[PDB]
Design a protein around this ligand. Sequence first.
Ligand SMILES: Cc1cc2nc3c(=O)[nH]c(=O)nc-3n(C[C@H](O)[C@H](O)[C@H](O)COP(=O)(O)O)c2cc1C
Ligand code: SF4
Ligand code: SF4
Ligand code: SF4
Ligand code: FES
Ligand code: FES
Lengths: 428, 39, 258, 87, 210
Amino acid sequence: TSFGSLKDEDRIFTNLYGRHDWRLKGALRRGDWYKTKEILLKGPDWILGEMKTSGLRGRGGAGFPTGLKWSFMNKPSDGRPKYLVVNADEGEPGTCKDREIMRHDPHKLVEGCLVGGRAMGARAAYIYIRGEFYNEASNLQVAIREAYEAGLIGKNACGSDYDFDVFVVRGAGAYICGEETALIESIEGKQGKPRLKPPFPADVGVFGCPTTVANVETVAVSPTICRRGGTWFAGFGRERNSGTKLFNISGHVNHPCTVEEEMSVPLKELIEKHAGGVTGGWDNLLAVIPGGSSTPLIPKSVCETVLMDFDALVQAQTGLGTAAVIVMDRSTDIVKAIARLIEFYKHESCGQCTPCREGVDWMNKVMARFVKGDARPAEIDSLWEISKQIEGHTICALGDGAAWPVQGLIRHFRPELEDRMQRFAQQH
Amino acid sequence: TTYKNLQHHDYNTYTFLDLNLDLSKFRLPQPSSGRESPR
Amino acid sequence: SNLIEVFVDGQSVMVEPGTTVLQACEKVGMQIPRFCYHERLSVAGNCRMCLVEIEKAPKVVAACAMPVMKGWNILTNSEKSKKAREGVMEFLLANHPLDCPICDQGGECDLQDQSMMFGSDRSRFLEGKRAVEDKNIGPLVKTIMTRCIQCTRCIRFASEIAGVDDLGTTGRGNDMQVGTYIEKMFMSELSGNVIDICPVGALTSKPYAFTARPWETRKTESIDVMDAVGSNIVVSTRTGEVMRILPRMHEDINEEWI
Amino acid sequence: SGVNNTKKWKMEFDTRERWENPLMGWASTADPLSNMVLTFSAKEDAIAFAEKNGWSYDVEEKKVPKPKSKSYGANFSWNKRTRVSTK
Amino acid sequence: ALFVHRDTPENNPDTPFDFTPENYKRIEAIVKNYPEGHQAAAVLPVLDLAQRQNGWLPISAMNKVAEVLQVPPMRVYEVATFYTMYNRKPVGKYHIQVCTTTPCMLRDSDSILETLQRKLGIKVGETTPDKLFTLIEVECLGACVNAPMVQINDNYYEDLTPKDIEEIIDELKAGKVPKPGPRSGRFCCEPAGGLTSLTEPPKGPGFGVQ
Ligand SMILES: Cc1cc2nc3c(=O)[nH]c(=O)nc-3n(C[C@H](O)[C@H](O)[C@H](O)COP(=O)(O)O)c2cc1C
Ligand code: SF4
Ligand code: SF4
Ligand code: SF4
Ligand code: FES
Ligand code: FES
């Protein structure tokens, strides 16, 4: 079939621009908290089956099947509580969606936390949000108070015997704290330093208890998925890329924006049918960073004749990531752009892993030199080998995300680097 | 129709913790580990 | 009897559950490299030097932390493991100081020996190194902190055995470093084992400073008299003079401490 | 932390006087068996050699370390003391 | 910066800092959010509350937080140095932090940083003599789409320009405080000129139910 052109009735995230209200009354008028009591009373297994049949995949980092991920914690009680944790930490460049969600549709997030907690047999839902999002978190807590007061949260959740506690928690300005385990440690009060897996949070997570991690988007879409059957969500993407999606389009575009479209939507249609279109025209474009800065880049020759989904982006070697398109054009220095982007990772590394720690700075220096051209081509393959050394010999995926961009750049823009080097050689 | 999210133009530093305090009364008894701390 | 059959380069081994790849290799006799691991401390996955390969697996695992599952086969002298070791040593020595002729941890350096065995023979690092402010944390322990490879052995020893909780990592990234945020002094009844435990010459003993080198010492095995425990000890002499004193493993008395 | 040196048995002697030369301060001796160290693969062979040659010998046993239970998960428990305060 | 402390007359355990009564109550309410045992999970919010009491974190405040939570002060210095939202050097009155990450950079945050450096007469890193503004360059913040942006104390100002930021800084230099949000016509994040969706109305409390 074909894809794109999603309708405002099949859209999930209304109030996306705050043109309606974001309070309990507006959420009621939009559909939130409808039948949630029966969604609960159906039981967890029902909800997990809906997740599975929905073909839903994680909307944070690497899309992983939410059904299996959440059923990992469908288990008995070893004598400890069991928690849910929503990583509202949204620090990956080009991403501005969770902010809008948390400040416009917080009641959806509350309902999704409740539903996931029931699905897992949990007790409390911590929401770890960036410490820079102060007003957004304040609105979120206002909504949580509205719920606690109404009676949709707490002891008798919505008319059942389920008790649930929703807590908000703030960070202090760290990008690594988006990681499953770094977030957990930061909540526990330690530094934002990840853990080695195993063990997996499903067994030993927050405070040592079974904690399931999730994302704002995923948990907030869960309820609509449940009350719409899964076969609706499922029928908008390819066999495995099913679902709507939030795309943050920025860069050298006329009208940068944040949109919700059908998955498998051509990037070109996403830039034209929305976003106001690239600046200078379709031919001024140079390349794209589709799925966030961590992901590598693809040039125009592929940006055209390409879809937008985990598969058919893996083929182009740039995973979908967070769906944060960063467009560029012929009036740029891709080397300087990606060098600043690697400096980002150099600053945001936590420190412990040898490869990451001692190699992201090496790479930042090498790229700062490559910009001017104070090198010789023999260093490009060395950069490649170093990136490959960092890729899989780390703890978390920050090293992988810092390596992939260099691979993409060296693979699709090598002649520019060689020319810069030759020009430096000429003008010693 | 026009913009609505204009409540945050007047928030203040201690807002979030004031509300966390207001809700501490609605919270439920947390569990226990049988220990004051890991010592 | 709750045991598991594992393979190490093809050879079968019986191991208890919860046992690690490193431990299985040791039970066979093989020995995985180490910088951050020590039998008597908690486990961390920082150095990334224990990385080996599992038959039918794309990613290399950490032998210090990965408990061995049934049926796994472990490839220790494989190209993937060796490339991982080479890269990790490249990174470790990227920002290391060329202080080996000043470093009293000179002929005893695990980093030296592992660079020679499992590491390459040249550098591709043509950039500028870093330097660190050296602390002062007592009259016994000398600190040249531009040699720390951030293994955390000192922090863990202190937190666990000596019950101090005064060492830690302040900062993040390559700008990170170890020690106390203040000029605190580390004077415990056990302060002095951080010296033997630090794989490098970042922590050294001020008394033994510059007096000798390992290949000169003659080593006798004796015991303590200071207390009534009988800690097994090594006395290292040179031309008829006592130069230092070291522990000696006796797992029923002192287990590597003095 | 290497153990490639605890694998072969060794036979050495008792140490004797090692005094100072007046001229230069060097270390002087008269025992010609002070730097004599022999290597064996078995205590039985070591002791047989010692007996053969006619030396009164003391013997020590191979102090092997114990097997240890390690659990990276123990550093994050909800109830125990093994919980670690720094990652 | 530096991750080492040398005691000065401005920073030392003798430096005066205690918690207010209302903030003690807030601390109690915070600690009641974590289980009985595992109460060191409040270090971050407590440090932030101390920053909000005084806009910078002294060694005395660190030791006080440690005394409160019965946690050693090393496990507080670690956090304070790890997380960048903590101020161990005294900040000014308004803490401008400009995103210089690739999106905002190619949408020319460089030019606004130049405008700001020129206007304030001080360069990145340092503060003003009157101790009113502190300027910093910073990484992504959550406004990439409205990329050219700033954060001053806790508010955002997006899509600004040289003239717009100069106007905001003049309003701040006066005794007046502005209102946060995009300063380029657009409201929050919608496409410039209008909408490409949400042109129709929503569905009532019931729809697509099954
Ligand atoms: C450096 C780094 C940053 C990350 N940032 C985020 C993030 O901002 N949001 C997020 O949801 N996940 C982030 N992740 C990965 C999360 O573990 C993952 O998204 C989450 O666990 C999946 O939640 P889901 O069930 O909703 O898919 C990050 C991982 C790394 C290594
Ligand atoms: S890869 Fe880097 S950021 Fe991730 S845990 Fe290791 S040191 Fe920290
Ligand atoms: S620890 Fe000392 S001997 Fe070992 S590599 Fe470093 S400087 Fe050389
Ligand atoms: S000082 Fe020595 S023991 Fe401590 S972390 Fe550094 S290398 Fe390891
Ligand atoms: S010994 Fe395994 S990571 Fe250090
Ligand atoms: S890149 Fe500047 S706000 Fe994200």
